[PDB]
Symmetry: D3
Amino acid sequence: EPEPQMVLSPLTSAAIFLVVTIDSGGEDTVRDLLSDVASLERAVGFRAQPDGRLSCVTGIGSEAWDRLFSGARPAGLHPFRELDGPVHRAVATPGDLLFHIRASRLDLCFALATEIMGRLRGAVTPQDEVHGFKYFDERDMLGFVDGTENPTGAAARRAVLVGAEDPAFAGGSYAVVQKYLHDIDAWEGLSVEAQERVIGRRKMTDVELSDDVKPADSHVALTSVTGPDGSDLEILRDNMPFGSVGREEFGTYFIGYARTPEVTETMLERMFLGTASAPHDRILDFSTAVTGSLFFTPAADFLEDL
Amino acid sequence: PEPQMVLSPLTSAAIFLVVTIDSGGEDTVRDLLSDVASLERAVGFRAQPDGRLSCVTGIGSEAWDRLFSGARPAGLHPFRELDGPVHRAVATPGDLLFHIRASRLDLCFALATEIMGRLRGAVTPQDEVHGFKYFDERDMLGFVDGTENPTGAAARRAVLVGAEDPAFAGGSYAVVQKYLHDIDAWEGLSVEAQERVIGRRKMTDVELSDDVKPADSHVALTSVTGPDGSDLEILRDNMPFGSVGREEFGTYFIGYARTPEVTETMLERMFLGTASAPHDRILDFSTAVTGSLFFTPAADFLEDL
Amino acid sequence: PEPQMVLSPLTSAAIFLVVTIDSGGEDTVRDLLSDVASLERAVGFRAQPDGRLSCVTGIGSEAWDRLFSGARPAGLHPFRELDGPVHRAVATPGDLLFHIRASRLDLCFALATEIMGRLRGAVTPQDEVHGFKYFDERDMLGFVDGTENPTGAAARRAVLVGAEDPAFAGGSYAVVQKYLHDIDAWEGLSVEAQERVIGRRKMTDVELSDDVKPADSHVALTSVTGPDGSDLEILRDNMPFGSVGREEFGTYFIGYARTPEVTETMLERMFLGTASAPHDRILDFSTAVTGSLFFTPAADFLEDL
Amino acid sequence: PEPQMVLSPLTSAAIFLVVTIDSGGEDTVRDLLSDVASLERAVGFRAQPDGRLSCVTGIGSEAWDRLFSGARPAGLHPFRELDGPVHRAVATPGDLLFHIRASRLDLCFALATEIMGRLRGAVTPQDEVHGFKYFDERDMLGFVDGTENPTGAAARRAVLVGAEDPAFAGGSYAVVQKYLHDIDAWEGLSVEAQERVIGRRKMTDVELSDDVKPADSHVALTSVTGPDGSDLEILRDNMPFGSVGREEFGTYFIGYARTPEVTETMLERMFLGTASAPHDRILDFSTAVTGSLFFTPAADFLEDL
Amino acid sequence: EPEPQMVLSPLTSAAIFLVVTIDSGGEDTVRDLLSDVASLERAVGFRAQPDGRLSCVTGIGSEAWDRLFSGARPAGLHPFRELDGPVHRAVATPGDLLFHIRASRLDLCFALATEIMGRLRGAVTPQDEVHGFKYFDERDMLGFVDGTENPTGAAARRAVLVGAEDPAFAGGSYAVVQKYLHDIDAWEGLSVEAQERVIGRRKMTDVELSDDVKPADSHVALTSVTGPDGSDLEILRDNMPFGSVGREEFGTYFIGYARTPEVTETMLERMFLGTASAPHDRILDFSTAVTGSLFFTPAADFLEDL
Amino acid sequence: EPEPQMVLSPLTSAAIFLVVTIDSGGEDTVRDLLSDVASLERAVGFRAQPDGRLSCVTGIGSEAWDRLFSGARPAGLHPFRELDGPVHRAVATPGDLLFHIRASRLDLCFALATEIMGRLRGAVTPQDEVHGFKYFDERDMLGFVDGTENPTGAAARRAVLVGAEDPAFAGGSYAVVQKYLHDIDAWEGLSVEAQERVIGRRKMTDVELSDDVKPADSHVALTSVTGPDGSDLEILRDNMPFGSVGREEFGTYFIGYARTPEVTETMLERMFLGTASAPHDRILDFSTAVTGSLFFTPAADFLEDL
Ligand code: HEM
Ligand code: HEM
Ligand code: HEM
Ligand code: HEM
Ligand code: HEM
C-alpha cells in the first residue's frame, strides 16, 4: 500500500509556501534532497512533539518531472493552463518544485524551510515565498470564513488521492497554487449584504445562503460542480492569508488538492470563463491571481525510494 | 456507511434539545435534517482546532412513522415506562433529539440557535439542558462518571448497528433520561455508605471488591453478561446540570447502544430489580423526570433526504 | 482598605444570584457574609492557577437597614424606576447580589452551591443567570461588548469609593438589569443599520466617526462628560445568557461605579432621552425585566461582621 | 487481539517500576494482572481529555512459567548479559515491568500507588525511576532523542507480534536498561566531537551525511538491515531521570520490538562492536546498571485471567 | 526600596528542594555562587518565558551565616530548635544552604539545580534533595487540598517580609523546612469523616468545619494562632508532595515563610507540645518529621552586592 | 499621575514593526491618528482577551516632533547619530513615527497595523515593515537565547522610564531601532566554541562565560557598561527574529528602550568604535545594520490629551 504525503491533514495556524525553479545542472542535487525531505521533516518536527504539527508536502511540476525522472509519468501532469477570460485571466507562472510547509508555529516552518533551501542553494532559483497566518476564526482577507466545505474522512480520501485510475502513481495528488491579491478598497465599498451575495454565505455566521437568494455568479454557486454521474466534485483547500500593510498587499494564497487536475481546472474554468448563467465569478472582481502553477505530489514512498 | 459522531468522547459543554414535531411540520423537519451536517460545519469550522463541535441527531419511533415511508430500524420503539414497586421510569414525549457537544458552550448555543431558527413553527420544545463538566469528570453525587465506557474497537462493536440490520448499519440507539437528585438526603450519608450505593470508591474511583460490593449497588446492577459469556456494554455521555436557587441538581443520562435491548435490560434491573436486589440504591436519591428513545441514523442517511 | 474583586476582568463563565432575605433570616445572612471570603478560597484554591474564581457580594438599601446599625453608604438607595415615554426601566426586589466569575462554570456552581446551602431557609431566590462568553467577547446582538471599560488607575478612580465617603472607602455600587432581546427584529436590520444603533462597526469593533455616529446611538447616549470635561466611566461585566427553546436571548448587565449617580445618569439618558435623542435605539431591541442597585463593601467590612 | 499501549507516543512524565515476585506471590499477582486495565481507567478517566495515562505491563521469562500454564511466547528468555572487552551489558532481576506514562506525574504516581497497594507483601521492588521530559525532547547528553522512531504502519510491523506466533499476536517484547552518564567527561568534548559520537547535529537534530558519519557513531551502529535489505527498527520510549545531589544523570532505556532478536542484535553491535567499530562510543559516557527483558501480552490476555 | 527574592510567589506544579552543608574551606566558592545565583536563574528561566515561571529562593542557616559574613546578623536567625514532645519529636538536622527551586516544569528546576551544584562541587555536601510535584487539585498525600488559607496580597507581604524592625535586612524572610513522611496504610484505614476530624476541613470540598464540630486537636485548630493584637498570625506555605512507591515513601515537604521565626515556632510548639486542650496535633499520628532546618532568605540585592 | 505606554511589557511571540515618514502636509492627519491610537488598540485587542496580549507603542522622531508640536521638547530627543567605525558603520535612516506592535498572535498585530495605516494613507510614506516571530526558546537567528539580561520589576522602571530629570515628559522612554541582517553562511562555519567567544555566553545553556575566558571583544563584554557611580547601565530589549529563506534574509530586529538615549548610544559606540582593548564587537563581523532610528515614546496620556 503506498503511503501518501500529508495532503489530507488539516489547516494549521502557520504555513510557508515555497516555489522554486531548478537551474540547469541542479537535477542531481534536487533528487538527493527529495530522498531526504521526510528525514528533514522528522529532524525538526520531533523537537516540538506533541503540538508542533509540522508537515511538508513536496510537489513536482510537469517540466521538472521530465528533467528528473525517466519512465511513466502521472496521467494528468501538465503545466498549469492559462485561462484567458474576457475580463479576468488566470496566469501561468514558473515553478518546478513546491514545498507546502505547515505547523502550529512559524518557527518550525522556518527552520524546516531553512534546512531544505540550505541543501538546494546553487541548484534552484526561488520564485515565490509566502508566510501564511491564521486570521481570527479561520477568516480570509475578505473577512469570510474560508475552508468550511472541505471534505473530511473518507470523502476527502476519495476526492484527493490518486487510485486505480492511475495505479503506478496511487497515493499521489495534484496541487494547484495561485497567489491572489485583493482590492480591499473596492471590497470595502460594498455593504455586507452585497459581499454576502458575492460569496454565497453569510459573513459573520458562515451559514450558506438559501438556494432562492444565492446568486448564480456567487463564488459558492460557481465552484459547486457535479459530475456526469451526479457525484459532487470536491477539492481540499488549504488557503492561507498573507500580506504587507505598508505595501497595501492583502492576499489569499490558494492551494487546492485533488486526485485529478480536471476537477480543479473545471472549477477554474467556471470562475474565469463563466457559464451560460454567469459571466464570471464575482470574487474575481476583487481578487487578482498573480501566480499559477500545478504540481504532482507523489506518494511518500516514491520520494524515499530515490 | 459513515456514522454520526456517537463514538466521540465527553466534552466540557453540551446542549441536549428534545422537541416534538407539530402536525404539519414534517416537511420543514425533513429539510432541516438534510442540512444539519452543513450547519454543524458552518459553526464548527470557525473554532478549529479546539472547538470539537459535534451534533448527533436522533429520531423517535412515532416520528419515524410520520417522516419516512420505507423500512424501520429493527429495534426502534417508544421508550417503555417501567412501573417498579417503589420507583418509576416515566416515558415522556420526544420526536427529535439534538445532542450537541463542544469544548465551549458558545459553539453549542450557536448551533442550537441555527437549528431552532429553521424549525420554528414546526416543532414544540420539550426539554433543553445545558450541561457542564464538573471538576474531574464528576457527577452531582460527587463520583467520577463514565469510567467504564468502552473505547476503540470495543466501543464500535457495542454502539454501532452492523450486519444484523444492514440497511441501518452505522446507526445507533440513544436513550435519554433527565434525573434530579435529592442532594440533602445524599449528603446525610457517610462517604462509605455512598460508596456502597455506587460500588466504587469516591475520591479515587477504584471499583469495590466483589467481596464488599453490594448486590443492589449501581455498578452491580448495571453489570450485565450475555449468554455468550461476554459483558454487554453501552456508551454513556452523561452530563451534570443544575440551578442552585431552585435546588435542582441533575444528571442528564444519555446512553448509546447498538440495540435498545441492552440499555433496557439495565433499566429493568435498576427499576424492577433482581433475585438479590429490590432495586438500584442510586434511585433512592435520583428521580427520572424524562424518558425517551431515539435512533441516530448514519450520517449519509440524513444527507440523502 | 482591601476592595472586593470589583476591578477584575471579564471571564468566560459567571453566575449572578439575587435573593431576598426572609423575615427572621438576618442572623443567618450576617454569619454567611462573614464567611464568604473563606468559601471563595475553599473552592477557588482547588483550581489555581487558572481558575480565576471570584465572588463579589452586594447588599441592597432596605437590606442594609435590616442587617447593620450605624452609618449607611452615602449613595445607597433603592433602584429608581424610569418610566420613559416609550421604554421603562423596572425596579425589582433584591437584597443580596452574588456576582460569581471564573474561567469554568463548575467553580462558579460549586461556590454558589456552598453559599446557598448556608442560606437555605433564610432567603428566597429572585434571579439566577448562568452567563457564558460568546465568541470574541460578543453579546447576543453580535457586537463586541466591554471595549471601552476603564483599566488601571482610571478604573480604580471610576469604581472605588474614596475620601468622599471615608467609612466606606474601597466599596463600589453595582447596578444590575437583566435584558431580553428581540433577535427576530434585530436580524431584520442590515449590518449598517445595526452599526448606527450601537455606534461601532460590527465585525471590527472600531467606533464610528463623530460625523456619522447618530445622536440616539448607544455609544452616543452613554458617553457622558463630567463637570471638568472628563468622561464619566463605569466598569461593565455584561454576560450573555439564554435558552434556545424559549427564544430567550439575553444580556445580563452589571455595572460598577464609585457613585450610582453616574450609572443613573446614563440610564436616564437611555430611557427618558434628551433634547437630541428620543431614547437609546438599543432599547427598541432590548427589554429590561429586572433592575436592582447594591453596595459592594470593602472585603474587610464583611470579614469583621 | 487488542494490544496494550505499546505504540503510543512519548509523554512528559513516566514511572518505570520493576519488581520480583516473592514466594507464594503468584495468586496476588494474577489477580492484579486481571485488574490492571480497570485500575488504569479508574485513575485515567479523571484527567480526560489531556491526561494521556497508560500502563504497559510486562512479564519476564522465569515469571511466565510461575504464573501461566500452556504455551510460552516464542522469543521469551532471560536477558542475555554481554561482557564486552571494555563495556558490559549487565543482567539484573526483574519479573514484572510497569511502564506508566502520562502528561503529568500525579497520574502516574496515583496509578503506581494503586498497583503497588495490591501487590504489597507479594513483590519486592527492584527499580523505580521517575522520568521527565527535558526541554525539546532531549536526553541528558543534550541530544534530541526519539527522532527516528517508526510511526504508523511501520511501527505496527516493527513492534507487534503477528502470525509468526499467533497465540501471542498483539504482544511485544520490551528490553529495559538503566544508564548513568559521565557528564563531566561528556562536557569535556567539543560540541562537534559529541556530534561525531552520536551521528546527528546537536542543536538542530539533523543527521550527519554519510560522508562524515563515523562508523563507531551511535546512529551508525544501531542502523541494521535484515537479509531482505529491510531496516530493522525498534520503538524507544527513553526518558531522562536524575538526582543532582548524587551526580546521577541518567537515561532510562526501554525499547519495544516484535522479537527480542532485533534489540539484541543492536546491543551486540553496541557492546561487542563490528569489523569497523570496537564498540559504540556512546558507551564511553554511559554505564548500564540494570538489564531485563519482558513480554508485554495483548491486553485481552491479561483481562481473561 | 529592598527587592525581595520570590518568597511571595505562588505554588507551582514542580519544585526541587536542595539542602547542603558547606564543607570546611568551601566559603569562598559559596560566596561567589551566591553572587551569581540570580544570573543563573535568568540564564535558564528566560528560555521558557512566558510560562516557565522559574524561580529560586536561596536561604542561609545560622551557623553558615557567621562563616560567610562579618557584621550584622538578622535578629531572628538561630538554629532550628528541636522539640521533644512526650510522643512526637521535631528533629533538627544539618543544613547551611537552601535552594527552593520552583517552575511549571521539572526540567527547568533540574537544569538550574544542575548549574548551581556544578558551581558548588567540592565545596558542599548534599543533605537532602526532594523533587516535588502537584497532586491533582492542589492536594497533599493525605488527600486534602493544601495551601487554601495562605495569605495573599498585602496580607502576605506583611506576614512574610522583614521590615523596619530589622532595617538592615528589610525584604528578607525566614524559611523553616521539614520533610514529613506519612503512614498511608494507617491513614487510609480511617473513614473520610475521621480524616476530616484530624484536619479540620471537609475532604472533597475543602470547606472548613464549623467551630461547633471542629476538634481542639485538629490540625486547623492548632495552627490557628491569634497574636497579642487579637489578629491572626500567618505564614506562607509552599508545601509539595513527593514520594517513591517502591519504598512506601509518601511525603509532604513542608516549607513555611514568615517575617519572624517566632510565628512558625509557636505553631510547631502547639503541634508537637500541645495546649491545655490538646495533647498534640492528630496530624502527627500519621506524619513523621525526618528533617528540620531554619534559614534566612535575604533580599535579592543582598546576595548580588557581595 | 503619568501612565506610560506599554514599554515595560514582556516579549511576545509575534510583532510588527512599522516605521514611516510624515509627508509634507501630513501633520494634521498624523495628530488625529495619534489621539486615537489607544482607542484603536482597544478596538482590536479586546476581542482577544485574555490571551491576545496586544499592545502598540508609538514613538516620534526628532524632526517630526518639531513639525507636530509646539512648546517643550524631550531633553534627550535628537536624530540617530551615525557611527562610522574603521570597519563597521551604524547607518542613520529616515523615520518619523514608530509603531511597535506586539501580541501572542500575528493576526492581532496585522489587524491593528491595518487600522493605523488606513488612517494614515496619503499622510505618510512607509520606510520599513518587519513581521517578527519567536524562534524556539527565545533564540535569535544566530542560535543564541536573546534577552536574558533584560531588567525586570523596579530595576526596569528605573532603567526605562523618564522621571524627575524631565518632569514634563515623565513616563516616556527612548527607543532605538536597528534592522540587522546576518551572514549565516559565515556564522555557520564557526565552531560552537568560537561562536560562544563572539557572544560571551554558552550557546545551548545560555550561561554566561566566566570572566577568565570571556573575550574583551565579545558582545556581552562590550555591552556591559558601568556608569561613574559604578552601577550597570541597563536597557530593555525587545528584539525579534525575522527573515525570508528564499532571499537568504536572516535578521534580528533590534529595539532597545532606555530612560535616556545616552545609555544606548554608549553601547553602540563601544560596539562600533571599540575600546582600548577591543577594536569592535565581533558580533558585527556577522551582522550588518541596514536601518537606524531614534524615537521618543511619550506617556500614554500625552497622546490622548491631543
Ligand atoms: C480568490 C481567492 C479565494 C477566496 C478568498 C475564496 C474564498 C472562499 C470562501 C470564503 C468560501 C466559502 C466557505 C468554504 O466553503 O470554504 C469558498 C468556498 C469554495 N471555494 Fe473559494 N476562494 C478562493 C479561490 C478559490 C479557487 C481558485 C477555487 C477553485 C479552483 C475555489 C474553490 C472553492 C470551493 C470548491 C469552495 C466550496 C464550495 C462549496 O461546495 O460550498 N476557491 N471559497
Ligand atoms: C442518576 C443517574 C446516573 C448516575 C448519577 C450514574 C452514575 C454512575 C457512576 C458514578 C458510575 C460508576 C463509574 C462509571 O463507570 O461510569 C456508573 C456506572 C454505570 N452506569 Fe450509571 N449512572 C446513572 C444512570 C444510569 C443509567 C440509567 C444506566 C443504564 C440504563 C447506567 C449505566 C451504567 C453503566 C453501564 C455503568 C458501568 C458499570 C460497570 O460496568 O462497571 N447508569 N454510573
Ligand atoms: C441591552 C444591554 C446592553 C448591551 C447589549 C450593550 C452593548 C454595548 C456595546 C456593544 C457597547 C460598545 C462597546 C463597548 O465599549 O463596550 C456598549 C458601550 C457602553 N455601554 Fe452598553 N450595552 C447595554 C446596556 C448598557 C447600560 C444599561 C448601560 C449604562 C447604564 C451601558 C453603558 C455603556 C457604556 C458606558 C458604554 C461605553 C460607551 C463609550 O464610552 O464608548 N450599556 N454597550
Ligand atoms: C545509552 C543511552 C542511549 C542514549 C542516550 C541514546 C541516544 C540516542 C540518540 C540521541 C539517537 C539519535 C536520535 C534518534 O533517532 O532517537 C539515538 C538513535 C537510536 N538509538 Fe540510541 N540511545 C541510547 C541507547 C540505545 C540503545 C541501548 C539502543 C538499542 C538497543 C538504541 C537504539 C537506537 C536506535 C535504533 C536509534 C535510531 C538509529 C537510526 O536509525 O537513525 N539506543 N539514540
Ligand atoms: C546583531 C544584533 C544583536 C544580536 C543578535 C544580539 C544578541 C545578543 C545576545 C545573544 C545577548 C546575550 C543574552 C542577553 O543577555 O540578551 C545580548 C546581550 C546584550 N545585548 Fe545584544 N544583540 C544585538 C545587538 C545589540 C545592540 C545593537 C545593543 C545595544 C545598543 C545590544 C545590547 C545588548 C545588551 C545590553 C546585552 C546584555 C549584556 C549583559 O549585561 O550581559 N545588543 N545580545
